[PDB]
Short mmCIF file of C-alpha atoms and ligand atoms in Angstrom, two decimals:
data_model
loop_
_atom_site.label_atom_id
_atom_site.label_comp_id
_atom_site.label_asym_id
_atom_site.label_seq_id
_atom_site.Cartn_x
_atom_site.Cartn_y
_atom_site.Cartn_z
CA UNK A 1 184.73 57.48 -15.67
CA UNK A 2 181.24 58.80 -15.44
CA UNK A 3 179.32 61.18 -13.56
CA UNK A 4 175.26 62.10 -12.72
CA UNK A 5 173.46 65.06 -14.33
CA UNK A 6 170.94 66.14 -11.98
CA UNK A 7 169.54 70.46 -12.19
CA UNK A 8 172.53 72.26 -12.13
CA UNK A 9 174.32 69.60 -10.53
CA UNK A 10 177.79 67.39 -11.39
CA UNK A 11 178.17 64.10 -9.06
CA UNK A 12 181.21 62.42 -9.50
CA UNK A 13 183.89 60.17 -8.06
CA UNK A 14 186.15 62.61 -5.59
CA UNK A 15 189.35 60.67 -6.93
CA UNK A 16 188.42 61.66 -10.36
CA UNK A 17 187.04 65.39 -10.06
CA UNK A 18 188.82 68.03 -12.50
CA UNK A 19 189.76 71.90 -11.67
CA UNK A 20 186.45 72.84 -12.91
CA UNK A 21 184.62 70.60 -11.02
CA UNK A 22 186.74 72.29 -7.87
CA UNK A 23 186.78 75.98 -9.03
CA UNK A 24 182.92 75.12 -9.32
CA UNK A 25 182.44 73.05 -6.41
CA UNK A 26 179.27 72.77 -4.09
CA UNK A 27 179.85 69.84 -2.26
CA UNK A 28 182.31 67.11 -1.41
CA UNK A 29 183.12 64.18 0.91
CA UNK A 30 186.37 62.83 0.84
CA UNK A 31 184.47 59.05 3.19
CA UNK A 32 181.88 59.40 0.76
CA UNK A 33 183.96 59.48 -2.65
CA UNK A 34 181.52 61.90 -4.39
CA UNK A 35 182.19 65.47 -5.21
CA UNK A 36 179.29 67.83 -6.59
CA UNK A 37 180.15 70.92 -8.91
CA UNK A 38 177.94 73.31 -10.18
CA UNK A 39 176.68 73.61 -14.19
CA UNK A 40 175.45 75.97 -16.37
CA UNK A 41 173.33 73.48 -18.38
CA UNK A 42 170.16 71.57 -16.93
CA UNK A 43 170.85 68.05 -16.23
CA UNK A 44 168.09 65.86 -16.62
CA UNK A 45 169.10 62.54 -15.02
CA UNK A 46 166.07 61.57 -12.37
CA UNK A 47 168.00 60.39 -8.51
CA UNK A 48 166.42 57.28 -7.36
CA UNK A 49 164.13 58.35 -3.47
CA UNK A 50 163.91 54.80 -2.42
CA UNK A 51 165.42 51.63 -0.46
CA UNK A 52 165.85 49.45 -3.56
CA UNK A 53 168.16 46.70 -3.33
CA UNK A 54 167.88 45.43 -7.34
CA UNK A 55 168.88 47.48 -10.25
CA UNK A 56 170.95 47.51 -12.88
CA UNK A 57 174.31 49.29 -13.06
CA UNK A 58 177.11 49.62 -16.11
CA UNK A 59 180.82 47.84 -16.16
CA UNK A 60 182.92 50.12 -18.87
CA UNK A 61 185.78 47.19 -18.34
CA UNK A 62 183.01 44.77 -20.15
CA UNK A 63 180.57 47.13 -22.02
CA UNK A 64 177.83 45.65 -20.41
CA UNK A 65 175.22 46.79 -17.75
CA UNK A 66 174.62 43.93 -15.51
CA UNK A 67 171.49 43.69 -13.03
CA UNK A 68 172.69 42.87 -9.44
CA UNK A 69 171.42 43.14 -6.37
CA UNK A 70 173.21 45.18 -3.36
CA UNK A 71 173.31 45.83 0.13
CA UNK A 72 172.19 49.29 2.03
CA UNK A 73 174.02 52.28 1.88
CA UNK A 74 176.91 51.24 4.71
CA UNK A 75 180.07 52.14 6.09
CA UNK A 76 182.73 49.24 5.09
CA UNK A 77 186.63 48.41 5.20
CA UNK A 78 187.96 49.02 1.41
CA UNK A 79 190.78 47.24 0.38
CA UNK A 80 193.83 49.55 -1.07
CA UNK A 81 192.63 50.29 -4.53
CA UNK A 82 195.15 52.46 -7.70
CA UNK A 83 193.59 55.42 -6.51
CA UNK A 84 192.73 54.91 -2.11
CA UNK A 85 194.26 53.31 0.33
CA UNK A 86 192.74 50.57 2.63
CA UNK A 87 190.26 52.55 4.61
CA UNK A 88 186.48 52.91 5.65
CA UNK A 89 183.98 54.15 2.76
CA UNK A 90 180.66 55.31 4.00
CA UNK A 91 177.90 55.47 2.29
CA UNK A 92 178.99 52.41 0.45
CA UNK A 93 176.59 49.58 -1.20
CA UNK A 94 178.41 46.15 -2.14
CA UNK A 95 176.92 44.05 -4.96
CA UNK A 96 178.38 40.53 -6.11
CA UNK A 97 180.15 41.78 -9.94
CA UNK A 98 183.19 42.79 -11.71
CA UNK A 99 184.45 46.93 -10.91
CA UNK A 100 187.89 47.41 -12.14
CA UNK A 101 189.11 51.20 -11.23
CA UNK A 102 188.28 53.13 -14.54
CA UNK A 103 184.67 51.25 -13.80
CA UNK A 104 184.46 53.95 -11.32
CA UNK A 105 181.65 56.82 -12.85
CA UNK A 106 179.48 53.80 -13.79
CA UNK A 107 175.50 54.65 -12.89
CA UNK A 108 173.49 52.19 -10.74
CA UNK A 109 169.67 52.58 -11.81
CA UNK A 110 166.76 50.95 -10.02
CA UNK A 111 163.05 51.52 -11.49
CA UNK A 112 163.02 55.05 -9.58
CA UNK A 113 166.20 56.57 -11.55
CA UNK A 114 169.80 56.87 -10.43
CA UNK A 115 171.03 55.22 -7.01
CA UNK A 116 174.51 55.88 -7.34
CA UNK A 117 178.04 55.53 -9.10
CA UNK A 118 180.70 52.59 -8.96
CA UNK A 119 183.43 53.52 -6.49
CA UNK A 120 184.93 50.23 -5.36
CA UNK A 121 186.48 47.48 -6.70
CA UNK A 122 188.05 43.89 -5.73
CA UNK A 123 187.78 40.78 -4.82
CA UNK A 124 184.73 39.85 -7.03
CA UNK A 125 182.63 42.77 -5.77
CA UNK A 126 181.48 46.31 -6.80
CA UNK A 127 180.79 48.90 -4.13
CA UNK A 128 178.76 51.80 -5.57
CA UNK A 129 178.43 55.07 -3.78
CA UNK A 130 174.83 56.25 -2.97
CA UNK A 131 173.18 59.45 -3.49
CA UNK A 132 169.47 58.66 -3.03
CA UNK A 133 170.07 60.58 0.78
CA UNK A 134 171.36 63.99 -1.09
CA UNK A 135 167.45 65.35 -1.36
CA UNK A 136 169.02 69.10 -2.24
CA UNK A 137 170.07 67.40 -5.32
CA UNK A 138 166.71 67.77 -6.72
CA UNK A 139 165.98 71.41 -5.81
CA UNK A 140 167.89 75.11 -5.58
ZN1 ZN B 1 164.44 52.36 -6.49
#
């Protein structure tokens, strides 16, 4: 689990959204796994605008935040996972590291603020999916 605080913006994993974040929803993308709700409260979390490759990101399955380094945003094959089938992710940055599905939430931070969430798993890699390209994020 985990999600991204940014204004009065929720960014979460699709597969894991609730009714509220639906009856409050601004934005989703089913390729993308993300879904954005509204909230009442200011968020304060800071979205990375950058083309990093190197950050940091955190693995609930081993309480531990592990620096990696990981590909550009991309559209790639995912294996069947609990909660997908096998099927193309876009959007989609693959670092070598351990993602088990309740990883899935998990923020990736570079030195510029938050690049994205975990949202793949498998075979020795994490896929995390980006939201340094969702500039409305940071205004309205
Ligand atoms: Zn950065």
């Amino acid at each position: 689990s985990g999600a991204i605080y940014v204004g009065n913006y929720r960014v979460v994993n699709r597969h894991l959204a609730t009714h509220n974040d639906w009856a409050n929803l601004v934005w989703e993308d089913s390729s993308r796994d993300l879904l954005v709700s509204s909230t009442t409260a200011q968020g304060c979390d800071t979205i990375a605008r950058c083309d990093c490759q190197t950050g940091v990101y955190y693995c609930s399955s081993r309480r531990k935040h592990y620096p990696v380094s990981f590909s550009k945003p991309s559209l790639i094959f995912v294996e069947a996972s609990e909660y997908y089938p096998a099927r193309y992710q876009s959007h989609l940055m693959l670092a070598v590291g351990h993602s088990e599905p309740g990883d899935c939430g998990g923020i990736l931070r570079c030195q510029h603020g938050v690049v994205g969430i975990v949202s793949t798993g498998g075979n020795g890699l994490v896929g995390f999916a980006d939201v340094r390209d969702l500039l409305w994020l940071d205004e309205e």
